[PDB]
């Protein structure tokens, strides 16, 4: 029973947590098919890993807060 | 009791220059041991006590 309020971008923090976390933590981090150009040493699959993990780390958090 | 055992093992055993780094104790103990713990107890009073 949590409709989208304007301040439900908790996941936008959670996504911003993730690639701020996982930039310094990947072993390879620039495989192929880059997003040219984009800040941070990412390829396109590495950045859509962090935005996918933050979109999963953020869904459990909003439901945790009911 | 585990921490004192751990910091006697040879690569976990601190060097001499770690002990005589006096400016770094004063920053961590004043801000953290004194300051955060006084902040945490103020969090304990307001939320709980």
């Amino acid at each position: 029973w949590s409709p989208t309020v304007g301040i439900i971008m908790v996941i936008a923090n959670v996504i911003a947590i993730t690639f701020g976390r996982q930039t310094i933590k990947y072993p390879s981090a620039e495989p192929a098919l880059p997003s040219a150009k984009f800040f941070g040493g990412f390829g396109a699959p590495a950045l859509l890993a962090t935005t996918a993990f933050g979109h999963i780390l953020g869904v459990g958090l909003v439901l945790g807060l009911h | 009791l585990f921490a004192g055992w751990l910091h006697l093992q040879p690569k976990f055993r601190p060097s001499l220059a770690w002990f005589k780094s006096a400016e770094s104790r004063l920053n961590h103990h004043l801000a953290g041991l004194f300051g955060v713990s006084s902040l945490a107890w103020a969090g304990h009073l307001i939320h709980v006590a």
Partner: protein, 161 residues
């Protein structure tokens, strides 16, 4: 819980000869275990072979009062504890035979393990094993009487303490 700390090991081999069929583990050579086993009366330095079997008989004769008196057939009757005394004394005698039967058969020499670096020198002669057998019967019977004396009146010692 890093020990030495990310390194190194404990199963170094027995006596630094890997071609011997034994290893040093934390059950072999942990110095609380090695101190315990070396100081049982079978292994303690400075004991007569009569003196070794005297403590071994008092210990094994002590707890064998237990399962006869509380699980035997007479355990509901008035002789519930006397049935455990005759069973415990009656089975030390069956062990006194087996010690004397082992001793008279020209018994082999005792081993030397890794937690015990020597056999205690009284366990290689027929005369040495016979003193161990004569002590076991004396201490085994006496160790079962003192278990019979304590458990037969449990309300009295607890009132007198």
């Amino acid at each position: 819980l890093p020990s030495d700390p990310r390194n190194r090991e404990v199963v170094f081999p027995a006596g630094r000869d890997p071609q011997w069929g034994n290893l040093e583990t934390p059950v072999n050579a942990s110095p609380l275990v090695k101190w315990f086993i070396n100081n049982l009366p079978a292994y303690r330095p400075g004991l007569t072979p009569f003196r070794r079997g005297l403590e071994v008989g008092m210990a094994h004769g002590y707890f064998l009062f237990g399962p006869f008196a509380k699980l035997g057939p007479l355990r509901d009757a008035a002789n519930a504890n006397l049935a455990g005394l005759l069973g415990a004394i009656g089975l030390v005698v069956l062990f006194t035979l087996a010690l004397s039967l082992y001793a008279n058969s020209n018994p082999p020499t005792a081993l030397a393990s890794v937690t015990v670096p020597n056999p205690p020198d009284a366990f290689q002669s027929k005369e040495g094993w016979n003193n161990f057998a004569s002590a076991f019967l004396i201490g085994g019977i006496g160790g079962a009487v003192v278990a019979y004396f304590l458990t037969s009146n449990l309300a009295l010692i607890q009132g007198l303490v």
